[PDB]
Design an enzyme around this catalytic site. Structure first.
Site, PDB file in Angstrom:
ATOM      1  N   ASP A  78       0.803  -1.219   0.000  1.00  0.00           N
ATOM      2  CA  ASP A  78       0.000   0.000   0.000  1.00  0.00           C
ATOM      3  C   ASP A  78       0.847   1.285   0.000  1.00  0.00           C
ATOM      4  OD1 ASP A  78      -2.723  -0.613  -0.036  1.00  0.00           O
ATOM      5  OD2 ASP A  78      -2.920  -0.533   2.101  1.00  0.00           O
TER       6      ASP A  78
ATOM      7  N   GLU B 121      -4.688   7.592   1.833  1.00  0.00           N
ATOM      8  CA  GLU B 121      -4.964   6.949   3.101  1.00  0.00           C
ATOM      9  C   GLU B 121      -3.767   6.460   3.845  1.00  0.00           C
ATOM     10  OE1 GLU B 121      -6.725   3.059   3.227  1.00  0.00           O
ATOM     11  OE2 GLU B 121      -5.311   2.514   1.653  1.00  0.00           O
TER      12      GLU B 121
ATOM     13  N   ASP C 113      -6.001   6.345  -3.315  1.00  0.00           N
ATOM     14  CA  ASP C 113      -6.296   5.063  -2.665  1.00  0.00           C
ATOM     15  C   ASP C 113      -5.446   4.053  -3.444  1.00  0.00           C
ATOM     16  OD1 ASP C 113      -7.325   2.658  -1.462  1.00  0.00           O
ATOM     17  OD2 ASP C 113      -9.355   3.359  -1.612  1.00  0.00           O
TER      18      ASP C 113
ATOM     19  N   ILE D 201      -4.478   0.643  -3.389  1.00  0.00           N
ATOM     20  CA  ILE D 201      -5.052  -0.643  -3.785  1.00  0.00           C
ATOM     21  C   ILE D 201      -6.339  -0.624  -2.978  1.00  0.00           C
ATOM     22  CG2 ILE D 201      -4.924  -3.103  -3.536  1.00  0.00           C
ATOM     23  CD1 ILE D 201      -1.631  -2.451  -3.382  1.00  0.00           C
ATOM     24  N   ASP D 202      -7.455  -0.331  -3.578  1.00  0.00           N
ATOM     25  CA  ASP D 202      -8.721  -0.402  -2.884  1.00  0.00           C
ATOM     26  C   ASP D 202      -9.236  -1.859  -2.884  1.00  0.00           C
ATOM     27  OD1 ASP D 202     -11.100   0.808  -1.716  1.00  0.00           O
ATOM     28  OD2 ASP D 202     -11.994   0.393  -3.590  1.00  0.00           O
TER      29      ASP D 202
ATOM     30  N   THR E  41      -8.687  -4.295   0.012  1.00  0.00           N
ATOM     31  CA  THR E  41      -7.571  -5.134   0.415  1.00  0.00           C
ATOM     32  C   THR E  41      -7.917  -6.546   0.843  1.00  0.00           C
ATOM     33  OG1 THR E  41      -7.748  -3.865   2.454  1.00  0.00           O
ATOM     34  CG2 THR E  41      -5.844  -3.372   0.929  1.00  0.00           C
TER      35      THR E  41
ATOM     36  N   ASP F  57     -11.469   7.216  -1.361  1.00  0.00           N
ATOM     37  CA  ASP F  57     -12.289   6.154  -1.926  1.00  0.00           C
ATOM     38  C   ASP F  57     -13.277   6.693  -2.933  1.00  0.00           C
ATOM     39  OD1 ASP F  57     -11.763   3.739   0.024  1.00  0.00           O
ATOM     40  OD2 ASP F  57     -13.383   4.509   1.214  1.00  0.00           O
TER      41      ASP F  57
HETATM   42 MG   LIG Z   1      -6.036   0.253   0.512  1.00  0.00          MG
HETATM   43 MG   LIG Z   2      -9.582   1.725   1.038  1.00  0.00          MG
END
Ligand SMILES: [Mg+2]
Ligand SMILES: [Mg+2]
Length: 400
Positions: free
Chosen positions: A54, A79, A153, A155-156, A158, A317
């Site tokens: 991430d 994030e 974001d 890698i949305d 996870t 996001d």
């Molecule tokens: Mg993530």
């Molecule tokens: Mg996320």
């Protein structure tokens, strides 16, 4: 003029190659994780490789942008922090560099000395991808860099990235889970008005050859800077694959028969509030993992509305996805504020905004979309959906 967007595209591709590489380079596949990370406020540094891949992806986009538009890198928020605690309890600040004091030497400290896993990753973070169209000699727009903030974001989804399922079948085009639900989200908003301006969604895992095992992915983009402009809608779902492969076939979900008889709605794995009204127009509500994936379903036309009722969506996001959606006529409006100011008593001011935080109340959870959201691509479709009239919803055939 110099498009920050063409660059956000090469760089989202470079994030996808890292996201795939961790599953593909055999050695890297091996460092998986164990628990659902977030005891968030008091510093909760929980699952090791997840947070490493991430932070790394957020860092590669921050730096490749620092490196091509000087000044940009300090306006890139996201994030993740750019610091990790390693084994020994040492807090490590993740800087790869450009021309570098080897990323290898940095990753060794986080990987307990692991010369192999260190080198597999430093190799892919430094591979140069060339990835170039559709806004080349076309959408030559200039936006003053001083008004631009970016929300990443990396890698949305996870959970889905980590569970690793390559074999799920989609209900009606919508994948309920699987690697297809993972997206790389990079949103660009205006610092003074708060309003999303441009967005890149890259799904790393769209098609996998089961003989060769390699995955191909898709990249979506939009820009709303009074000119509104978007990705030729297109993923290899509804194009080469049994459909728009003749001349100019553009009447599939993205273009589908204007509007009249049925709402398709997507909601998360964990969503607990309501449903609409069947004999009016439907009750096609689907569960789907991915905050960014569910927005993408609305962008692509597979779903008409995406509703999320809780406070656990954040700006990173929604921003990339809200901007593509604005370039097509849609947006993302706050849920509780619609449920209070019944729709048209003061109009497009409950569009989500990304410059302001919420009272500094939760300390660290400054950047949540408090009373949820509704993402939509046609305001007509949005005006139909919200019409679930309590104290009069038993006329299930709302003529209006
Ligand atoms: Mg993530
Ligand atoms: Mg996320």
């Amino acid at each position: 003029m110099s498009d920050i967007l063409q660059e956000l595209l090469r760089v989202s591709e470079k994030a996808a190659n890292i996201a795939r590489a961790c599953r593909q380079q055999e050695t890297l596949f091996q460092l998986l994780i164990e628990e659902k990370k977030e005891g968030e406020k008091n510093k909760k540094f929980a699952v090791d490789f997840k947070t490493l891949a991430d932070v790394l992806v957020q860092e590669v986009i921050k730096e490749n942008m620092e490196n091509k538009f000087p000044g940009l890198g300090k306006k890139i928020f996201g994030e993740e922090s750019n610091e990790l605690t390693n084994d020994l309890g040492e807090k490590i600040i993740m800087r790869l560099g450009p021309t570098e004091e080897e990323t290898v030497a940095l990753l060794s400290k986080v990987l307990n000395g692991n010369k192999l896993a260190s080198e597999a990753l430093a190799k892919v973070v430094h591979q140069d991808v060339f990835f170039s169209d559709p806004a080349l000699d076309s959408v030559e727009i200039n936006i003053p860099q001083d008004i631009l903030g970016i929300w990443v974001d990396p890698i949305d989804s996870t959970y889905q990235y980590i569970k690793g399922s390559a074999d799920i079948t989609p209900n009606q085009g919508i994948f309920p889970s699987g690697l297809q639900c993972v997206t790389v989200l990079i949103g660009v908003y205006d610092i003074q008005t708060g309003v999303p301006l441009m967005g890149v969604i890259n799904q790393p895992f769209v098609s996998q050859d089961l003989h060769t095992r390699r995955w191909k992915g898709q990249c979506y983009w939009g820009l709303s800077y009074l000119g509104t402009n978007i990705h030729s809608l297109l993923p290899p779902v509804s194009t080469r694959s049994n459909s728009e492969a003749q001349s100019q076939g553009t009447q599939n979900p993205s273009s589908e028969g204007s509007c009249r008889f049925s709402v398709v709605i997507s909601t998360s794995e964990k969503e607990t509030i309501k449903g609409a009204l069947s004999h009016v127009c439907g009750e096609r509500i689907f569960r789907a993992a991915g905050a960014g994936y569910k927005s993408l379903c609305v962008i692509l036309g597979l779903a008409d509305i995406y509703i999320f009722s809780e406070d656990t969506t954040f700006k990173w996001d929604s921003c990339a996805a809200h901007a593509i959606l604005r370039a097509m006529g849609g947006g993302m409006v706050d849920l509780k504020e619609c449920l209070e100011r019944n729709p048209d008593t003061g109009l497009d001011l409950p569009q989500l905004v990304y410059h302001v935080g919420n009272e500094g109340a939760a300390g660290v959870d400054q950047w949540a979309n408090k009373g949820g959201l509704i993402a939509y691509r046609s305001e007509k479709q949005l005006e139909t959906f919200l019409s679930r009239l309590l104290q009069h919803l038993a006329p299930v055939a709302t003529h209006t």
